[PDB]
């Protein structure tokens, strides 16, 4: 049932490439008539034991999760020669929130942007109740089912919190909280930070010039060296350097962003909290 047969998975197109993963659109079509279900398939870009072990854990993790705003696990598919291992998932027809927002911005108002925001908060809340830290939260990882539902769509860098400890110690630096940057410590709090950045991406409607890597580079200066970029970002963050209130953004909204971007871990709000505020802010909007 959870087992998918490699010969019946017809390739259709590529959808994209993540950290070490690759994503394909496939039809699972045993009857050979093309009536089978279109599904999304993630596999190791280039397989090795460590990545496989990691990937199997990613799989156990997604298997772990039932939620409205988390993409649906379907099953797995073992390749002959055990060369690939594939994660089978429900196909969401609009791609990532990044690209969806990128080109249907005309019909996306602040109101919708908050429906999207609460949904993401709830997913993370639930993620949170399972003691899982996403670590890689961003519009490019959030997927659009239809205009009224988005789901967290990748968990390729998701980790389990050790039984006692409240953080994990071990990519995309402009979404990272500072203690993740300096101490490599990830937690529910570092996810709230990144979520602040997602909130930002949202109300920038993904102008390419207004992306976080761009805006921060506009600070770090595009003249700096290599590793020198992190180091300057840190310093900048240490002294409360922050992304700007995007054009047209309500300070009520921006205020959450900066609340999430708190140098002090514990002062950062909870997803529980965040979801409620957003929802209330939403209700108010009446026009
Ligand atoms: C032409 N056409 C393409 C799309 C469009 C293209 C992109 C994606 C797509 C539909 N549906 C998904 C699925 C899903 N579970 O079905 C999972 N992740 C994807 N992208 C990942 C790439 C790596 C980074 C993480 C996200 C895609 C819509 N129309």
Swiss-Prot record:
Domain remark in the UniProt entry: Possesses 2 protein kinase domains. The second one probably contains the catalytic domain, while the presence of slight differences suggest a different role for protein kinase 1.
Linked pathology: Chromosomal aberrations involving JAK2 are found in both chronic and acute forms of eosinophilic, lymphoblastic and myeloid leukemia. Translocation t(8;9)(p22;p24) with PCM1 links the protein kinase domain of JAK2 to the major portion of PCM1. Translocation t(9;12)(p24;p13) with ETV6.
Protein's name in the database: Tyrosine-protein kinase JAK2
A GO cellular component annotation in the UniProt record: caveola
Swiss-Prot/TrEMBL keywords: Adaptive immunity, ATP-binding, Chromatin regulator, Chromosomal rearrangement, Cytoplasm, Disease variant, Immunity, Innate immunity, Kinase, Magnesium, Membrane, Metal-binding, Nucleotide-binding, Nucleus, Phosphoprotein, Proto-oncogene, Repeat, SH2 domain, Transferase, Tyrosine-protein kinase, Ubl conjugation
Active site location: 136 (proton acceptor)
Annotated GO biological process: actin filament polymerization; activation of Janus kinase activity; adaptive immune response; apoptotic process; axon regeneration; cell adhesion; cell differentiation; cell surface receptor signaling pathway via JAK-STAT
Oligomer and partners: Interacts with EPOR, LYN, SIRPA, SH2B1 and TEC. Interacts with IL23R. Interacts with SKB1. Interacts with STAM2. Interacts with IFNGR2 (via intracellular domain). Interacts with LEPR (Isoform B). Interacts with HSP90AB1; promotes functional activation in a heat shock-dependent manner. Interacts with STRA6. Interacts with RHEX; this interaction occurs in a erythropoietin (EPO)-dependent manner. Interacts with ASB2; the interaction targets JAK2 for Notch-induced proteasomal degradation. Interacts with MPL/TPOR.
Membrane-crossing segments per the record: none
